[PDB]
Amino acid sequence: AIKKYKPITNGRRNMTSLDFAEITKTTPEKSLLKPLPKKAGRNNQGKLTVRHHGGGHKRQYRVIDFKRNKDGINAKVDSIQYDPNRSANIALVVYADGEKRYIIAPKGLEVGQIVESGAEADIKVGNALPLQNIPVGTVVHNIELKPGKGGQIARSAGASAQVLGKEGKYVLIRLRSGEVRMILSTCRATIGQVGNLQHELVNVGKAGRSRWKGIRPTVRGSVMNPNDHPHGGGEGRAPIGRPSPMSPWGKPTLGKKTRRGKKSSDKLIVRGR
Amino acid sequence: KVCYFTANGITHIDYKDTELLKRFISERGKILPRRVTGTSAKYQRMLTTAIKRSRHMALLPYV
C-alpha cells in the first residue's frame, strides 16, 4: 500500500507514496469528464479570499453519482480509477442497461462485483439504500442530508459512519468526527467504508509536491508586520504577546467556537464531536 | 461409585437434551462437579460442552 522511497536525495528522504495497486485502469471515461479550471482561491470579484491556493497540476473533473438513485438495476464494477479531485478512488460501474457512472470506491470493492440501490437492495458494500432500510449498527458512507440531493457526509478516503438507532422520522448516526446526530430516514447511504485507507499515511516529503497539489506557502503571522497581522512586528522573535492567538483578520483562533447559533440542525445534533 | 453415562452405555450427549442436562446442573444453574455427580472425566467434558451449547441456545439458563 505505502511505498517508501530510498533517500537518493534530501528531497526524497522520508518521502512515501501510495503504490496504486488498487487502480485497474489508468485513464478516465471520456464521456464523464468536464473541464475544471482553477480558481486559486479568488472569488467573483477577482480578489483572493482564501490564502494558499494556486498553481498545481491541471485536472479534469469526473462526474460522480453521489445520488445513487438508479434503483432496481444491477451495476457491474467495470474498474477502479484514480481521481485527482478527491482523496478517494472512483469505481466506473456499468448498469445492466448499459449506462456507465462513477461512484465513490468503497474499501474492498472488486472489479466484476455487482452493486445496486433502492429499498430492496442487499446490505453489502457498494449498495445504496435509505437509512430506513439500512439495519442498525451498519457502517455506511456517502450519506445524504436531504433526500434526493446526493451524499454529502463520509466521502473522504477511509470515511465511514455507523447507524445507531431509529427514531420516528430520523435515524441516529455516529459520524467520523465522533458527532452523533439525526438524519432524515428517507436519506440514502451506501454500505461500507470509503476505500483508499492509506491516503492519510503519505509523507509528502518535499515542498514541490505540495506545489503540484496546488498548495501555496503559509507565511506565519509572527513574521509579518503589525499592519499585516495581529502577531506582526516586535523586535527579534516575539511570543504571542496578548491574551489569545489571533487570526490574520483579528479574531481569536485557539479554542474560540464559531458555530453559529439558532441553526436548524441544533435540535438534530445529539452529541458533538 | 458409578457413572450415569457409563452405566446407561450412552456414548454421546445431545445438547438439546435439557431434561438430562438438568440432572447434572445445579439449582442455580451451575454445572455440578464431577466428584459430586459421580461421572467420569471423559463424559464430564462432553457434559460441560453440551451444557454450554444449551446455555448459548437458551435451552438452559446461565444464572
Binding site: P135 | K16, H56, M57, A58, L60, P61, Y62
Partner: protein
C-alpha cells in the same frame, strides 16, 4: 460433512411471515450444493432468558449435509442481518 443448524424466530411473528422466513432460510441452507437431510419445527418454546426482550421463540431444527460450508456461511450472514431470527448455531456433528 453433516451440520445441525438450530435457530430461533421471534415470538411476535405472524404465521405467514414465519412460514416464508423458515422456507427462505431452508432454501438458503440448501443452495450451495448442500442437501437438506431434514428440517423440522419444535414449536414456540419458553426461553431460559429474555433475548431482545422476548420470553418465547419458535425453534427450527435443520440437518443438512454438504462438502463445504458456503450454505452455512450464507445462512449465518443472513441470520445476522435478519431482525426476525434471534439466535442461531451450527454444529458439525
Amino acid at each position: 460433512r453433516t451440520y445441525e443448524v438450530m435457530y430461533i424466530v421471534r415470538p411476535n411473528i405472524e404465521e405467514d411471515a414465519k412460514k416464508a422466513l423458515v422456507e427462505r432460510f431452508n432454501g438458503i441452507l440448501a443452495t450451495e450444493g448442500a442437501e437438506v437431510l431434514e428440517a423440522k419445527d419444535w414449536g414456540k418454546r419458553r426461553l431460559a432468558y429474555e433475548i431482545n426482550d422476548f420470553k418465547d421463540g419458535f425453534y427450527n431444527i435443520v440437518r443438512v449435509k454438504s462438502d463445504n460450508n458456503k450454505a452455512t456461511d450464507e445462512f449465518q450472514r443472513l441470520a445476522k442481518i435478519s431482525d426476525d431470527i434471534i439466535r442461531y448455531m451450527v454444529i458439525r456433528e
